[PDB]
């Protein structure tokens, strides 16, 4: 749901009342998403959301901040 302080989601049928309220609610800049699990670690960007969140499927659906690649520092010295 886009641009909503997510506490207002239940206001606006047979099976739709499992994706309203519910158990997992994540609040992001784009809005709030229901049905996903926040994860601390990061991976490559699957299906994108916005403001740096890329949801994906792993057995459930996760929503994580995006990764930009693997760190790599070059051993630099003035005579090598």
């Amino acid at each position: 749901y886009q641009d909503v302080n997510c506490t207002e989601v239940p206001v606006a049928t047979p099976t739709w009342r499992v994706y309203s309220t519910g158990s997992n609610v994540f609040q992001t800049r784009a809005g709030c998403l229901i049905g996903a699990e926040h994860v601390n670690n990061s991976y490559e960007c699957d299906i994108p959301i916005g403001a740096g969140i890329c949801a994906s499927y792993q057995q459930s659906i996760i929503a994580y901040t995006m990764s930009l690649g693997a760190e790599n520092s070059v051993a630099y010295s003035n005579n090598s």
Binding site: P48, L68, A70, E71
Partner: protein, 415 residues
Amino acid sequence: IAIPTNFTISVTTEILPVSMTKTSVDCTMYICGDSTECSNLLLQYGSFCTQLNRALTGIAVEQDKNTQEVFAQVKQIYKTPPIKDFGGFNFSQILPDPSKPSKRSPIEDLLFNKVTLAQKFNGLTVLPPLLTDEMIAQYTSALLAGTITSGWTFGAGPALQIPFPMQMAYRFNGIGVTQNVLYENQKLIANQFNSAIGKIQDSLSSTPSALGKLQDVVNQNAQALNTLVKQLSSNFGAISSVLNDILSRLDPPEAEVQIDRLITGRLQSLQTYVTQQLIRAAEIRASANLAATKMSECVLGQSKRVDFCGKGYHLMSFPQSAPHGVVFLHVTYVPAQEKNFTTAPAICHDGKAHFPREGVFVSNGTHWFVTQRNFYEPQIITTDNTFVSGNCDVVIGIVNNTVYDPLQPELDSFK
């Protein structure tokens, strides 16, 4: 002929937009607005709104594609060594600064501060960009660290380290000036480079508005959007501009005509707005493609195309981010302090014509010397920096002069 005897390093700024604000508008909230009969009447007009929303979504995605293309060009995130001993050069202005907000270098902070600028209205929505500013700063930092440490090799394959005063040494070798020039003027070159980068941020700040394009586009968007809102309060040849007034003060069969007039007017206005947005997005995408090209050729390698990056012979470039675009700093080599001499096509000694292997012939008035083309370091004419060909009389404009031979004295002492 006229040959230079000195040089100046220079740094030049270039600014390019890469993306615009992603927006979204839905008909039913805008054209009619929380009214059932208006929606019923609008349903007869067909599928205009589906195609309008599709058209806007196309641009919304294309913006993220543009940013990804222009910036995301590195497989890994490099990082500068903790210590800074780049042979006397100084990159403190452009490198990220920790004791500051998140990651921005001083110049990026000046850029964000200088550029200054919609809220929630009826039916309009703004979507956040897919890449936050911190990620963009991370990409630019990775690119800058890679090009400082590893030259251009990280563009082709795997990064290979190289001392900076040695990579610039044969970055001169590209533009035709031999190596020893740098190794013998290192201190002066470093001072000129540092001074130029010091000057660039004052040049940006003192001028009240040199950003220009980056700001300009933003204004346009806002202006256009405003007119759309101001198009909502128009009678369009009807009784009143408020739908509730029309529906309340008259019977439905009579008021249907007025409702239809408002529908037509608002629909036409929306059509014009969408067409304008498409046309503008095309040009923005063109600029983004040009920016991606300039990134690839100029940042990840030296360039041989004249005036593609800066004015003068090209050395390297450094990228910096901006609110909705990119800023390049091109470093160029410009000759100066020219002195003029007299030349000749080829020498004629011992009946044979000698041409220069690489360089030209010059003369200060009595004697003759061979020098490289972009600098003045005269050398004695020998038989290993010249090659022989043909006979004497064919060429027009030759001159007479001896050609020294190195082996002759050595075998003379040891016949």
